[PDB]
C-alpha cells in the first residue's frame, strides 16, 4: 500500500443547528437534563471522542480538526504577547539599557486603586514587570524596534486565522480518510525533514543573516538606531564582511567542501558571551545547521511510495530476544489503531523533554541578557518543570486509557506488553520496596539531622562538617566536563556550561553562571528527588498495570477507566480505577516538583547567583547557607520558607501587592480543596435534600434537580484546587522574592 491523499468531500454540513442543542454529541446527553449531573457530564464528555462515535475515521477527523483549533488559540496567544511587546512595553528603552531597565508589558488601567501595580520598571515607563523572557527572545531574534513587533503580531493573527480556517476546512469541506492518518512512516519523514530539519535550517539562515550581525553590533555597543535594518545585510554585503569576513568567499566554499572558510560565523566557542551572558550566536547558528542536516538525513529512514526505506513494523518485529518472547510484535498495531497510545507516548516524552529543556536553559543561557535576569531564570525553569510534570502524568493517564479501552489480547500476545502484564506483581512489589528504601534513606536522614541538631549534637549529623555523604559520581562527571576543552573535546574552547567548571562569568556586576559545587546537602536532595519520582512512578505504573484487573477486582476493565469504586465490600474497594491512580499521582507529582523547584531556588540563590566584587569575589544572595541549612527540615522551614517569604507578606502598599494578594488567595484555594478531598457526596446530597425542601416550600424548586457532585467529580475538583492553590502559592512567593532580591 502506498501513501496517498484520499479525501471525503463535504462530510458534515456547516450549520448553527447543533449549537442550539447542548450535548448533541452523546446519545445519552441528547435527551436533555433531568438532574444537574447532566451539566457536568456535558463537559467531562465533550472531548471524549470515543464516546461520541465508535468509528476510528470520524474520531481521527475530529482530532485533526481540533488540533487546528488549538493551534489557532496558541498563535493568538503568541501574537498577543508580541503585540503587547509592540504597544504596551518598554522594549525599546530596554534595548538601550538591558542591565537597568526591568522588562515590562501589561500596563494596568487606573481604576479602584490598581494603578499601584504600575511600578517604576525603568526606561521612563510604568507597568507590571514581566518574567516570561519575551524581551530576551526578541533581543536574540534581533528585533530593534516596535514596528517589527507589530508586523510579527499581525502576521501571527493572520496565521492564527489561517489555522482556524484549516480546521473548519478539514472537517466540513475536505476531510481525510482513515488510511491517510495511518501513514506513520510518511508523517515521520515529513516531520523530521520539514517540520524539524527544514525549520531548523531556515532558522539557521535567519541566525546567520539577521540575529548574529545585529547582536554582534549590539555587543560592540553601537546604538539601537545606528544598527541598520537587517535587509541591508543582504543588499549591502559589505556590512556582513566588516563583521563576518567569511562571507567574502561566498557560497563556493560550501559546495567545494572548504567549510573552514565559514569559521567566522559557525564557531564552536563553548561557553558564554561575556557581554550578554548568553550563548554565542555563531554557536547557535552552527548548532541549527548541524541539527538541520541531521534531521534531514534522519527523515529518510522510513519507507514511502518508492521502495527504499523501512517498515516500522518490520523493525519492531525483529527486536525480540530470549528474555522477552515475541518482543515488539504487536506494538505497531497498538500505536496505529489507538490514539490514546500515541497520546501516552507523546505526552510522556514531551513532558520529559520539557524537564530537560528547563535543566538546559538555566545552565546554558541562550538568550542575550537572560542569565543576569534572575527573575526570568527562576520563572522559566519552574514553569517548564511544571509543564513537564503535568504532561508526564497525562502520559500515564492515556497509557491507562489505552489499557482499558484499546488493549487487544490477540495483538499483544507474548510480546513485551503481554509479558509486563504477566509479571506486574513482581514489578510493583519491587518498586514498593525501592520507594520505602529511598524514603528511609533520604527523609530519615533529614529527621536524623533535625534530631541531632535539636539534641545539641551537630557532630553526629549527616553534613559536610560531620558524617559526610559526598556525591562522588556527580563530582567525577563534572570534573570530566571541566576538562573536556582541549582534551576529549579538542575543538571547544570553553566548557559547555560553567555549572560544571571553568570559572565565574560576570555580566554587569552579577553572576551569569559559576560552578555549582555538590556536597552532602546536594546528595540528600537528589535522593529526595529520586524518592519522590519513584513514588509517583509507583502510583502511575500501578494504575496502568492494574487498570484491567487485580487480585481484588477481576473484571475491572468492564467497569471502565473512570469509576469511583466497586462498593464497600471486599473490605472496601474505593479508588481502584486507573483514573484514581492518576488522581493520587497528581499529588505526588506536585510533591516531587515542588521540592525540585525549591532545591533549584535555594541552591541558585545560595551558591550561584549574586554580585561580583571588582576584585572578583562572589557575594551570594542568601550568603552560602545551603550547605548547613538545607540538611534539616527546620532549616528549609526557617531559612527558606520563613526568610524568603518576607517579600510577599510585606508587599502591601507597593507595586508587588498583587503578589501578596495572590499568596493569600492561593492559600485560600488550597485549603478550599480539602473540603472536596476529605468529604464524600452522601453528606452533600443529604444537605441538598433540606435545601430543596426549603425551595419546595417557597415554590422555587428547579426542574433540573440539584445533585451533589459525583465521587469522581469531587475527587477531580479536590485535586484541581489543591494543585492550583499550591502552585499559585509558590508562584506568588517566587515572584515577590526574586523581583526584590535579584
Amino acid at each position: 500500500k502506498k501513501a496517498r491523499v484520499i479525501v471525503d468531500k463535504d462530510p458534515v454540513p456547516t450549520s448553527f443547528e447543533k449549537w442550539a442543542q447542548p450535548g448533541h454529541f452523546d446519545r445519552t446527553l441528547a435527551r436533555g437534563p433531568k438532574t444537574t449531573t447532566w451539566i457536568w457530564n456535558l463537559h467531562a464528555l465533550a472531548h471524549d471522542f470515543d464516546t461520541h462515535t465508535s468509528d476510528l475515521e470520524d474520531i481521527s477527523r475530529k482530532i485533526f480538526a481540533a488540533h487546528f483549533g488549538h493551534l489557532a488559540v496558541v498563535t493568538i496567544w503568541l501574537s498577543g504577547m508580541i503585540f503587547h511587546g509592540a504597544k504596551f512595553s518598554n522594549y525599546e528603552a530596554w534595548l538601550s539599557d538591558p542591565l537597568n531597565v526591568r522588562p515590562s508589558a501589561q500596563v494596568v488601567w487606573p481604576i479602584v486603586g490598581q494603578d499601584i501595580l504600575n511600578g517604576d520598571v525603568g526606561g521612563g515607563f510604568h507597568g507590571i514587570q514581566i518574567t516570561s523572557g519575551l524581551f530576551q527572545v526578541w533581543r536574540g531574534w534581533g528585533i530593534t524596534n516596535s514596528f517589527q513587533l507589530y508586523c510579527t503580531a499581525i502576521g501571527g493573527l493572520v496565521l492564527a486565522g489561517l489555522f482556524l480556517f484549516a480546521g473548519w476546512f478539514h472537517y466540513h469541506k475536505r476531510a481525510p480518510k482513515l488510511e491517510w492518518f495511518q501513514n506513520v512512516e510518511s508523517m515521520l519523514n515529513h516531520h523530521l525533514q520539514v517540520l524539524l530539519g527544514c525549520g531548523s535550517l531556515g532558522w539557521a539562515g535567519h541566525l546567520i543573516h539577521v540575529s548574529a550581525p545585529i547582536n554582534k553590533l549590539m555587543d560592540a555597543g553601537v546604538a539601537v538606531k545606528d544598527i541598520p535594518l537587517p535587509h541591508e545585510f543582504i543588499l549591502n554585503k559589505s556590512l556582513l564582511i566588516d563583521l563576518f569576513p567569511g562571507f567574502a568567499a561566498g557560497l563556493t566554499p560550501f559546495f567545494t567542501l572548504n567549510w573552514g572558510q565559514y569559521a567566522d560565523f559557525l564557531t564552536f566557542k563553548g561557553g558564554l558571551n561575556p557581554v550578554t551572558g548568553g550563548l554565542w550566536m555563531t554557536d547557535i547558528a552552527h548548532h541549527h545547521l548541524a541539527i538541520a542536516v541531521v534531521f534531514i538525513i534522519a527523515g529518510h529512514q522510513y519507507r514511502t511510495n518508492w521502495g527504499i526505506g523501512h517498515s516500522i513494523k518490520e523493525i519492531l518485529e525483529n527486536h525480540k530476544g530470549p528474555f522477552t518472547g515475541e518482543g515488539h510484535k504487536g506494538l505497531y498495531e497498538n500505536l496505529t489503531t489507538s490514539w490514546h497510545a500515541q497520546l501516552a507516548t507523546n505526552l510522556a516524552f514531551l513532558g520529559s523533554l520539557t524537564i530537560i529543556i528547563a535543566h538546559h536553559m538555566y545552565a546554558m543561557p541562550p538568550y542575550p541578557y537572560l542569565a543576569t535576569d534572575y527573575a526570568t531564570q527562576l520563572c522559566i525553569f519552574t514553569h517548564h518543570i511544571w509543564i513537564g510534570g503535568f504532561l508526564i502524568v497525562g502520559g500515564a493517564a492515556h497509557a491507562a486509557i489505552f489499557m482499558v479501552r484499546d488493549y487487544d489480547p490477540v495483538v499483544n500476545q507474548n510480546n513485551v506488553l503481554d509479558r509486563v502484564i504477566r509479571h506486574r506483581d513482581a514489578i510493583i512489589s519491587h518498586l514498593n520496596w525501592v520507594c520505602i528504601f529511598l524514603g528511609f534513606h533520604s527523609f530519615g536522614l533529614y529527621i536524623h539531622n533535625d534530631t541531632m541538631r535539636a539534641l545539641g549534637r551537630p557532630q553526629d549529623m549527616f553534613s559536610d562538617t560531620a558524617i559526610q555523604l559526598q556525591p562522588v559520581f556527580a563530582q567525577w562527571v563534572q570534573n570530566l566536563h571541566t576538562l573536556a576543552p582541549g582534551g576529549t573535546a579538542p575543538n571547544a574552547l570553553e566548557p559547555v556550561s560553567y555549572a560544571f567548571g571553568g570559572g565565574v562569568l560576570a555580566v554587569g556586576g552579577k553572576v551569569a553562571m559559576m560552578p555549582i559545587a555538590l556536597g552532602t546537602a546536594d546528595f540528600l536532595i537528589h535522593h529526595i528527588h529520586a524518592f519522590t519520582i519513584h513514588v509517583t512512578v509507583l502510583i502511575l505504573l500501578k494504575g496502568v498495570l492494574f487498570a484491567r484487573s487485580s487480585r481484588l477486582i477481576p473484571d475491572k476493565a468492564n467497569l471502565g477507566f473512570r469509576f469511583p469504586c466497586d462498593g464497600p465490600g471486599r473490605g472496601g474497594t474505593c479508588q481502584v480505577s486507573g483514573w484514581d491512580h492518576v488522581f493520587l499521582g497528581l499529588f505526588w507529582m506536585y510533591n516531587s516538583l515542588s521540592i525540585v523547584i525549591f532545591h533549584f531556588s535555594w541552591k541558585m540563590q545560595s551558591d550561584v547567583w549574586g554580585t561580583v566584587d571588582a576584585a572578583g569575589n562572589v557575594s551570594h544572595i542568601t550568603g552560602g547557607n545551603f550547605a548547613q541549612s538545607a540538611i534539616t527540615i527546620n532549616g528549609w522551614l526557617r531559612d527558606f520558607l520563613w526568610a524568603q517569604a518576607s517579600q510577599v507578606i510585606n508587599s502591601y502598599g507597593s507595586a508587588l501587592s498583587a503578589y501578596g494578594l495572590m499568596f493569600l488567595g492561593a492559600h485560600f484555594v488550597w485549603a478550599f480543596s480539602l473540603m472536596f478531598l476529605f468529604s464524600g457526596r452522601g453528606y452533600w446530597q443529604e444537605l441538598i435534600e433540606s435545601i430543596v425542601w426549603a425551595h419546595n416550600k417557597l415554590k422555587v424548586a428547579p426542574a433540573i434537580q440539584p445533585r451533589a457532585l459525583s465521587i469522581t467529580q469531587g475527587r477531580a475538583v479536590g485535586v484541581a484546587h489543591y494543585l492550583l492553590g499550591g502552585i499559585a502559592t509558590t508562584w506568588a512567593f517566587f515572584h515577590a522574592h526574586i523581583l526584590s532580591v535579584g
Binding site: 490477540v410 502484564i421 487480585r551
Partner: protein, 135 residues
C-alpha cells in the same frame, strides 16, 4: 477434573498459598475452536478446542471468566470448589440451570414478607440476638 489447561507462559497473578491451604477453585468449559481470551489474573491465554480446565484463586475469577465466555458464545462453563482434602464440590451453576432463569425446585431464602420501611426500630429489638432485618 477433566480438561486441558489453557496455553500461556505463566504469571505472577496465579494461585498463591491459599490454594494449598484452604480453598482452590476451577472452571471447565468446552470450546468449538482454539482462540485467545484474557485471563482474570492478567495476560493472554489460548483456550483449546474441546474441554478446558483452568484453576483460579477465587470464585469471582471464574464468574468474570465465564462472563467473558458468554462473549464467545460458550455457555457450558462449570465452577468447582476444591478443598485441600481433595474434596471437589460443584457450585456453579448449582442447580444445573443458570440462576438468571427460574427453575422449579428452588426455595426462597432470606425473603421478607413486607416492604423495607416496615422493619422494626433498633430500640425495639435492643439487647436481643435479632436484627431489624431478621424477619
Amino acid at each position: 477434573l477433566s480438561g486441558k489447561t489453557p496455553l500461556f507462559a505463566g504469571s505472577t497473578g496465579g494461585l498463591l498459598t491459599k490454594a494449598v491451604e484452604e480453598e482452590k477453585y476451577a472452571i471447565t468449559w468446552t470450546s468449538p475452536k482454539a482462540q485467545v481470551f484474557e485471563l482474570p489474573t492478567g495476560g493472554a491465554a489460548t483456550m483449546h478446542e474441546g474441554e478446558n480446565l483452568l484453576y483460579i484463586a477465587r470464585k469471582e475469577y471464574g464468574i468474570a471468566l465465564g462472563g467473558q465466555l458468554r462473549k464467545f458464545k460458550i455457555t457450558n462453563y462449570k465452577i468447582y470448589r476444591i478443598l485441600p482434602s481433595g474434596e471437589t464440590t460443584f457450585i456453579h451453576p448449582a442447580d444445573g440451570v443458570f440462576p438468571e432463569k427460574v427453575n422449579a425446585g428452588r426455595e426462597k431464602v432470606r425473603f421478607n414478607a413486607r416492604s423495607i420501611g416496615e422493619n422494626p426500630n433498633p430500640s425495639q429489638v435492643k439487647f436481643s440476638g435479632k436484627a431489624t432485618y431478621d424477619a
